[PDB]
Design a protein around this ligand. Sequence first.
Ligand SMILES: [Mg+2]
Ligand SMILES: [Mg+2]
Ligand SMILES: [Mg+2]
Ligand SMILES: [Mg+2]
Ligand SMILES: [Mg+2]
Ligand SMILES: [Mg+2]
Ligand SMILES: [Mg+2]
Ligand SMILES: [Mg+2]
Ligand SMILES: [Mg+2]
Ligand SMILES: [Mg+2]
Ligand SMILES: [Mg+2]
Ligand SMILES: [Mg+2]
Ligand SMILES: [Mg+2]
Ligand SMILES: [Mg+2]
Ligand SMILES: [Mg+2]
Ligand SMILES: [Mg+2]
Ligand SMILES: [Mg+2]
Ligand SMILES: [Mg+2]
Lengths: 198, 98, 188, 107, 186, 125
Amino acid sequence: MFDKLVVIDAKGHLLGRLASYVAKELLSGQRIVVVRTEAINISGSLFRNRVKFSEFLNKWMNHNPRRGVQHFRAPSRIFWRAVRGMLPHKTPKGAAALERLKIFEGIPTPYDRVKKQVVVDALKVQRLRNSRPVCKLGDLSASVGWGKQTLIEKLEEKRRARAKTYHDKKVKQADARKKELAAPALKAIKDKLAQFGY
Amino acid sequence: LRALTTVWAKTIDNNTKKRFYKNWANSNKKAFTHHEKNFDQKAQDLLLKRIEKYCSVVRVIAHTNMSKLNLRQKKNHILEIQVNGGKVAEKVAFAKSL
Amino acid sequence: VRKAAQEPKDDTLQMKVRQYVVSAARLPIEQGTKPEILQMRVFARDEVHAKTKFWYNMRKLNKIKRSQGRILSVNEIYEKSLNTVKTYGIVLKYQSRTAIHNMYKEYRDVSLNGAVSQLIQDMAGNHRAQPDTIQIIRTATLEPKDIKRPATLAMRNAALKFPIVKTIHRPSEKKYRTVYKATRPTTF
Amino acid sequence: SPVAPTRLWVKAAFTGFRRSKHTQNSNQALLKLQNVNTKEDVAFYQGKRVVYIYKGQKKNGSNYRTIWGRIGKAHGNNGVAVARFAHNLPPQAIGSVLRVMLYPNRA
Amino acid sequence: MRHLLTEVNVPIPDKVTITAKQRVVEVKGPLGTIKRAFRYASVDIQKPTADNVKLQIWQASRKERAVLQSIASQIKNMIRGVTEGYKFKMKLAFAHFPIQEAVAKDGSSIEIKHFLGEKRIRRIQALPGVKISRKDEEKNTLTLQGIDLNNVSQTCALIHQSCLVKEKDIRQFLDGIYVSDKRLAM
Amino acid sequence: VFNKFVQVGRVVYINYGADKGKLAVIVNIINQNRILIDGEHIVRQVIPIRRVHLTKFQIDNVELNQRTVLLKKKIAKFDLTKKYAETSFAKKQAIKTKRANLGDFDRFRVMVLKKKLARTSAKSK
RNA sequence: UAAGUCAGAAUCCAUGCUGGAAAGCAAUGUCUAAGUGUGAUGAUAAACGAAAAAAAAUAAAAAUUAAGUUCGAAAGGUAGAGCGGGGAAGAGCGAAAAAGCUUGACCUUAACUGCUAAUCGUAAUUCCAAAUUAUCAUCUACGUAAAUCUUUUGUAGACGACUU
RNA sequence: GGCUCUUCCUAUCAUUGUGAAGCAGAAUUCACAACGUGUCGGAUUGUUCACCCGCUAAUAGGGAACGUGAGCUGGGUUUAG
RNA sequence: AUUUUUGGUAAGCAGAACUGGCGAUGAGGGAUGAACCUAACGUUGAGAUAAGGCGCCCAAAUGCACGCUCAUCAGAUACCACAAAAGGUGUUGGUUCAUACGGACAGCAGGCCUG
RNA sequence: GAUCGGGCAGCAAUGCAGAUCAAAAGGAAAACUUCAAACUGGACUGAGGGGCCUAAGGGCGAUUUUGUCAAAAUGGCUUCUA
Ligand SMILES: [Mg+2]
Ligand SMILES: [Mg+2]
Ligand SMILES: [Mg+2]
Ligand SMILES: [Mg+2]
Ligand SMILES: [Mg+2]
Ligand SMILES: [Mg+2]
Ligand SMILES: [Mg+2]
Ligand SMILES: [Mg+2]
Ligand SMILES: [Mg+2]
Ligand SMILES: [Mg+2]
Ligand SMILES: [Mg+2]
Ligand SMILES: [Mg+2]
Ligand SMILES: [Mg+2]
Ligand SMILES: [Mg+2]
Ligand SMILES: [Mg+2]
Ligand SMILES: [Mg+2]
Ligand SMILES: [Mg+2]
Ligand SMILES: [Mg+2]
């Protein structure tokens, strides 16, 4: 909660839980960024959650639809509404809380590099019996016509490929430095530290 | 979608320049000057190659020449006309030919 | 919070039932007499509770009421060896919204108190029984020839193996608790 | 110069005051000390002095200002502790980091 | 309650080879190779020995238990499928209007015309691995052959169904293309 | 695959207990959530299998419901002690225990020793 | 049908269409006189390592139960030293919100050496960084592009607005 | 009460896709997903209703202060002749 | 209002009995709200509670252990905002009668029996 | 010594190993309840301004030391914020 900016990778995370956590963190001052929202999970038939999101599409301000609720169809915003729900968002304090959260789908530029984090309690594998039903957000936003799923996939692949580069370089050199750590001069100091309670 | 870039020719006739101005004749008519004096064909080709590299859609920026008609308005019209054809590269080639 | 000695170190793991013997006699209390003593085995969480259980059953079974008698004594019974697993049979009557029922139940546990505690939790969850309603007719530590239930007989074999298929992450102390960590756990 | 050399204070967060749904005691702030997790560990700070620093216009040549207090007691079973200050903390303070200092060492 | 262990044993006979990786089953025999993806069940598919394939499910509930025997049987079908294939015969049934048929050379598509005298054209494309055939001696029949049970049975289905009669008593009309013979070994 | 099972006579790590960080053996499986536990450093306990972690040490000598004593013997003959002691797990664990006991000077040392390991590697020759 | 699969509606979602002051974003034309102008005072729901880039899989594996990790971390000085750190130009690469990565004139710094620390008197933020930007005052430049009103059009119009 | 206009309900009149029949066809009846779209012109009556003449895929039943008087109308109802 | 009550198909209807209460009364809890639950009020600090809670809005357990539950209309609790007669080879318990290597159930077989 | 079984053996007849109950003779220990003795860290508070009093020990209800403070500093006012 004290790290300057937490960045969460929403993949395989359960909506409501990741929600509450990020909410609290937000209230208490942690500035968060959540990513890969399209990858969040919800417990239930994709059908059932489409029924539900439909049921929501159905609510509106009667005389003037263009006043009040906007029904947002991107995973980012689905999550966002989710969190705003768990804060006192009409309160100036609640406002601040909100301003702290930023959300995206896929993993956009500034965030390639920074280390993505996970909320352990929020994981589908951790939370849900394996044989019970679930959806990925982006599937819902598909049924509700958010068009970018395909694009995001392509984009993600692109970035995955940059990863293999980073990693591989990082491995090669980081083996070479571990090998030369076993050479005589340093082998000495190694031993000194081991004894020192490595 | 988003605009990646616009490649202008050397030749942009006064009336089209009119688009950028409310009155042409009380203006020093400074538009596109820098595009002219600094014009480097190499760079243009570079931009087109760019578009080939990164782009989904290609459109031509098009010019309604009002001087051919007898109407009051002489100030031309500036349109995007998208180009539909199989391969991005060929789209670009075509656009260039134009 | 008063523990009976035979309960586990962690209070969590078992209910606060203990097994009591209560015995009393018709109040007139004639001295040199050889009194009829009424004795019964009750499961309760208290001495008080046990007394209640006692009297309820006693006034149902016989003429006696409390103003009509005296409590001689209340003695907790303990289980012999907490080193072995035993199969217990229990015979119940409980009260469901429609009517009253006689059930026979079996549990594999280390204590008859454990057998009972498990019995209660089960009876709540599966049958929506109310503790107060439950009446345990008779209880027997079961000889293998006598064990009738499939989920009981299910566990007799030495070849028993459970893989642990899913490990839900549970830090050792609170001191280690973090909401969000820099890498994903594993199951196995 | 890049930073301050040594900072001997633990980071605390200001959660809010001690409250019930409709009622709040603003005498007792609640803090969460960094890497402090259970009541046991919080206890360790029992007497400790804690500061609230904030900035502002020049007052006696210093552009900062302060409110001093002490953590008194464990609040609830994760790491949370009541603090009392000299002046009950202003409420916007809630979003912010307070300095737990180790000054109270006694025999 | 929850069941501890449940197993099912799949025999593997002459000329069959089987592959289990991360729930993905492959079966290669004389007639070809079939693969299926079981990622949807929590089941354990044990490394096959040229003799057998063992399937296990742990800590299961009544609903879960059924998935075992069903995945198993599907495997049975993959195997038997690559040993002796699957052939179906569909009798082509009409009262007055003769059902006219044109099947391609791939054996991959069927055209049905003149159904109940309708002027419409029926188009049915057979699933992958499925071949459709009609001979001079077939006496108004179709024959669908393939390795994979599903693709073949399903192709038969799509055919039978394309011709369902509508808006009249179905018990008098009965025109249609129905499966006469199912699960033939070639 | 499934190589490591919970069996009569398994070697298990007690985590999340009063007994955390201690090895034990399993004499009986009580229901599906609880096993019966023993060892030299631990009383005879019943524990939810949840609190325990399987160690990949199976002692086939152990017998169903074995008395505390005989078990302790079999355990000793098996060298749970030596064997576990070599484990990456216990090695790391001990290393931790080491880091635990260090004073201001110890840290400082480790830091200068840490800087040296960095700045000195150019000593080829 | 329980897992798993096909078909399948005037339905739903899209496609097409009209809005679009969403206190959203992009590409492009020209201009922003004079300086990588300075001074003082200020504000920013949160600076004192507020440190940290594999990808995927949780019924996987030959084998590793926790970021319960790893890296950094010496005096908020001076004089030397110089492991090491940061980078002009130009030339490379880089686009999901181009954030930056390479090379590189050069700029700089740790061990070690000498001075300097004490009288900030047994505590009272350890007021210094980084990214932004307000106000007042001033030095240089007294220019450049464009718009609007007073005209014009009637493809528009209650008036503003709009086409020209 | 009508006129005008908008929206909602579904206990669906019609239109779409179906299941059922004492379903041969045609017509009809029972049921399901379902309002998405449509549901009219005149006699007499102040009429709501009712009854008739007609066209129609059909001429469904309802709600919204028994929708709707600073929107009309004023025939009815309820001052004073 | 609890309990008891009469007329009434019934009513947030109309009448009666005992004790309260609301009116004349705030505080915490039932989100909300006269008569419910705790509890009765001078100004103020500490501590420990009742009623009720402790995933987030929200103080406090994403505590530790049990049983049961998958809803293409889940469920989420006093006064409270309603559901019945009637049905289900969904799943789990229990009750009473039955079969089984002197080989059952079922299927395939074969001539009630038999592999 | 006696029973038992969710063992290894053994083709069977039988043995090895268990677990439960347990004779006389010995050992060595845990949990619970009650009642006692004592250590160390915190928070809030200091009402009153005596020489009187005694169970001969004390009681009668905080003292000591040190630092800072001249500047709008502290307290307040107007306005605003949470
Ligand atoms: Mg029909
Ligand atoms: Mg018909
Ligand atoms: Mg489909
Ligand atoms: Mg609809
Ligand atoms: Mg209906
Ligand atoms: Mg009917
Ligand atoms: Mg008319
Ligand atoms: Mg009206
Ligand atoms: Mg009159
Ligand atoms: Mg009563
Ligand atoms: Mg009344
Ligand atoms: Mg009463
Ligand atoms: Mg009362
Ligand atoms: Mg009155
Ligand atoms: Mg009251
Ligand atoms: Mg208080
Ligand atoms: Mg939980
Ligand atoms: Mg002031």
